[PDB]
Design a protein around this ligand. Sequence first.
Ligand SMILES: CC(C)(C)O[C@H](O)N[C@H](CCC(O)O)C[Se][C@@H]1C=CCCC1
Ligand SMILES: CC(C)(C)O[C@H](O)N[C@H](CCC(O)O)C[Se][C@@H]1C=CCCC1
Ligand SMILES: [Ca+2]
Ligand SMILES: [Ca+2]
Ligand SMILES: [Mn+2]
Ligand SMILES: [Mn+2]
Lengths: 237, 235
Amino acid sequence: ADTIVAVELDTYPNTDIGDPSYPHIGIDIKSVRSKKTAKWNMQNGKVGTAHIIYNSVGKRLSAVVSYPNGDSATVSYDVDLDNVLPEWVRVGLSASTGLYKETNTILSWSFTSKLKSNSTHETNALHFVFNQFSKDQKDLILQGDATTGTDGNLELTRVSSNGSPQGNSVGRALFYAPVHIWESSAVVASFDATFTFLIKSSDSHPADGIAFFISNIDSSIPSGSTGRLLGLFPDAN
Amino acid sequence: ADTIVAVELDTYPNTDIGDPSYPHIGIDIKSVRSKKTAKWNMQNGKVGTAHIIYNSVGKRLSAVVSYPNGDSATVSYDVDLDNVLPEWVRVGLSASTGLYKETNTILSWSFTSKLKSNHETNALHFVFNQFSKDQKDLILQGDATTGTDGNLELTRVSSNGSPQGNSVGRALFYAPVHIWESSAVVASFDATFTFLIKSSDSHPADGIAFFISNIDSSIPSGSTGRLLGLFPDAN
Ligand SMILES: CC(C)(C)O[C@H](O)N[C@H](CCC(O)O)C[Se][C@@H]1C=CCCC1
Ligand SMILES: CC(C)(C)O[C@H](O)N[C@H](CCC(O)O)C[Se][C@@H]1C=CCCC1
Ligand SMILES: [Ca+2]
Ligand SMILES: [Ca+2]
Ligand SMILES: [Mn+2]
Ligand SMILES: [Mn+2]
């Protein structure tokens, strides 16, 4: 079982897995059962924006999803992610479909991590921005059904050439470089990710969702990780 | 009068008011009496760094002071600045000395604020690693001058290199900061300065603070020594 820290955009209410009875954002530490959730008025076929932020001083991971009509949901959780994450990690995006299905299209993705040790404004830092994904995107490690098509969009799960999503699909995009999320003597580690998405469905019950995740370097899509496990977890412990 | 939010590097234990009995860092919302505080053993004459951090989603203002030897102190407060702060305000540095005195030298000051919404994102980043005699993007107040040594001297220093007593100075960024907004999914900022606090006297005073306030903030009077150039009295 890989280590996973994630912010999950859960579109399908699995009440078997302990998911509230509505779509929701959640914060997941090493389990699909969120540590904290908030109700999320998913808007069909609209372009949504997610922001994940964490600084290691206040030790609070936060997320906010928002749609252009003004509506948004926030969730936040307290943890020393240094306790739970390895020094070095990859970061990425995950999505999945089940019997219910939905476009898991990523239009934009950006990330910044910064390690500020004990000195004069000299920081280890990494910052990347993707607003156009391209067929051959050599700095993404695509896994599963994820393709970065020619439309400038990351499709984390399968889609027909006719705009209909495929069920039973799992996909993920990881930055190629490992990220220095922490190190022993590190007074401030902090990161933040934004991504824009289009989750659209002809279904009543689009499913399932998209997630920003951090896991160890040679993280692969774990088996039995589709639909409700959003490509992150092998099972639902 | 002019609302304030500060992170104070308070070097002098003023129990006549509300400090703790050791030098310290604290988060001040409208009052010198820190809403939270942490023990901070400032290292005389050693160059240190301070990082203020805040995002409008988690509602937690955080701050950490560290020196090169590894040592650092941290303090956080849950607070929704959007509720305490005008949409538009200036940010700055402030410092003061009293009977006891020390250098309040700023070597570097940087600042980022970002206001997002539904890639509609307004932002303001600035960085000073060298201050110059003619810093037209700083509004200097009180005894603050931008020395010839490339540093910002918030309180008065001698031509010799020693500190004045009973001094109070502050540097504010010229441009007003849009610190939050109506359709603001995220309104976050973060600020580090590096500083050199030096005394020969056995107990230095009084401290340095990063602060946020309305656009027309001026030093309220007599806030020297224990009030760190920020609040009029000790309420
Ligand atoms: C929504 C999001 C963009 C994540 O806002 C975060 O607070 N990042 C801001 C700065 C924007 C970042 O994209 O540069 C402050 Se958080 C902190 C900034 C320095 C790097 C670590 C994260
Ligand atoms: C403490 C805090 C305010 C968070 O420091 C940030 O890293 N701003 C620095 C400013 C560096 C300046 O050169 O811009 C990093 Se932001 C900047 C963005 C891309 C180029 C280098 C770093
Ligand atoms: Ca679910
Ligand atoms: Ca004091
Ligand atoms: Mn869920
Ligand atoms: Mn104090």
